[PDB]
């Protein structure tokens, strides 16, 4: 019976889902960032919890430790690369200060809304899911894509898109024809 291939859950149910302020908070987060359901919020919270728990464990270690230095530097480098952590807050105490909202704007959906390609968060998700948006060479249809700084600088409409310079859509060409006939 082949040795099992590793897999993991990307989210965990909160300790008390029904607490009123928690419901209001997830309502706010979803509406601000146009999330489909709470599952994305739980996934992001789980990721933040793991990261900040690692940061706390490292802080518990005495300074100048080889482990503290090595893994702390690695975590800070990853966090700044993903854009969550600013260049001038490259310290573990600031990693401890992160919030779910930060990862949320680091979602591609937020930037495609944000740069002016879309007027609104929901229109932005519609554009993403419809293959109208390209990172560099690559068309991305995943709203949850986490954008790097080099990556956010390269957001654009895809070449194949009708908005990116291609021919009009089936609807547009159909209406143009029926106007011609």
């Amino acid at each position: 019976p082949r040795a099992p291939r590793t897999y993991s859950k990307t989210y965990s149910t909160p300790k008390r889902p029904y607490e009123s302020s928690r419901l209001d908070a997830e309502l706010k987060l979803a509406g601000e960032f146009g999330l489909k359901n709470k599952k994305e919020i739980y996934r992001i919270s789980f990721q933040l919890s793991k990261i900040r728990r690692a940061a706390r464990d490292l802080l518990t270690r005495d300074e100048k430790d080889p482990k503290r230095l090595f893994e702390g530097n690695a975590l800070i480098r990853r966090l700044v690369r993903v854009g969550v952590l600013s260049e001038d807050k490259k310290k573990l105490d600031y990693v401890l200060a992160l919030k779910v909202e930060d990862f949320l704007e680091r979602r591609l959906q937020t930037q495609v809304y944000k740069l002016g390609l879309a007027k609104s968060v929901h229109h932005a998700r519609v554009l993403i899911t419809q293959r109208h948006i390209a990172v560099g060479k690559q068309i991305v249809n995943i709203p949850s894509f986490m954008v790097r700084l080099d990556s956010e600088k390269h957001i654009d409409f895809a070449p194949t898109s009708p908005f990116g310079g291609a021919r009009p859509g089936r609807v547009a060409r159909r209406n143009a024809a029926r106007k011609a006939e």
Partner: peptide, 9 residues
């Protein structure tokens, strides 16, 4: 002014 700028930071 726009707290909703992509270049806020």
């Amino acid at each position: 002014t726009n707290d909703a700028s992509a270049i806020k930071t």
